[PDB]
Design a protein around this nucleic acid. Structure first.
Ligand SMILES: NC(=O)CC[C@H](N)C(=O)O
Ligand SMILES: [Mg+2]
Ligand SMILES: [Mg+2]
Ligand SMILES: [Mg+2]
Ligand SMILES: [Mg+2]
Ligand SMILES: [Mg+2]
Ligand code: NA
Ligand code: NA
Ligand code: NA
Ligand code: NA
Ligand code: NA
Length: 94
RNA sequence: CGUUGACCCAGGAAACUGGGCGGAAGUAAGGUCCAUUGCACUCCGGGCCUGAAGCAACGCG
């Protein structure tokens, strides 16, 4: 049941798991910095966290625009599925 | 691993202390086979193969 409550952070899944962590992070940044200031991008290839990423924007409006505009975009041959993060990210609790 | 140092962070009036920061390690990472659509921020699934680096220098291994 898709998370639709707006947030500073977007949650992305259905990411291609064969992409190297570093290259994935850099591609995500390239794709999303257009939408606004990104504080951070959290990427892990653990069993639990692979295929997934969190990109943290400074403004909520940036996250919203990023979410709406990049939905379903084919990224390393896989359509990105984007929702808002369920709860705030740490840096945003600061 | 040692020495003499550089830079960043926390604390300290300071001296400096603690990290970042070296043989680290069969680790991080990479290839493949299997498994996985998973809401995290304190790494981190399994097999086989491969496999690094402190910031500088010199010494040692
Ligand atoms: N990793 C290391 O311990 C490097 C040592 C090497 N002798 C050097 O001068 O850099
Ligand atoms: Mg001070
Ligand atoms: Mg010191
Ligand atoms: Mg030293
Ligand atoms: Mg050296
Ligand atoms: Mg020797
Ligand atoms: Na200080
Ligand atoms: Na004091
Ligand atoms: Na240090
Ligand atoms: Na691999
Ligand atoms: Na493997």
């Amino acid at each position: 049941v898709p998370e639709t409550r707006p947030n500073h952070t977007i949650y992305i899944n259905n990411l291609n798991e064969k992409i190297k962590k570093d290259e994935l992070k850099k591609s995500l940044h390239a794709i999303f910095s257009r939408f606004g200031q990104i504080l951070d991008i959290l990427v892990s290839r653990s069993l639990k966290m692979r295929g997934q990423a969190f990109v943290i924007f400074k403004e909520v409006s940036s996250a919203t625009n990023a979410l709406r505009s990049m939905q379903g975009f084919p990224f390393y041959d896989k359509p990105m599925r984007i929702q808002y993060a369920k709860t705030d990210s740490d840096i945003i609790a600061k």
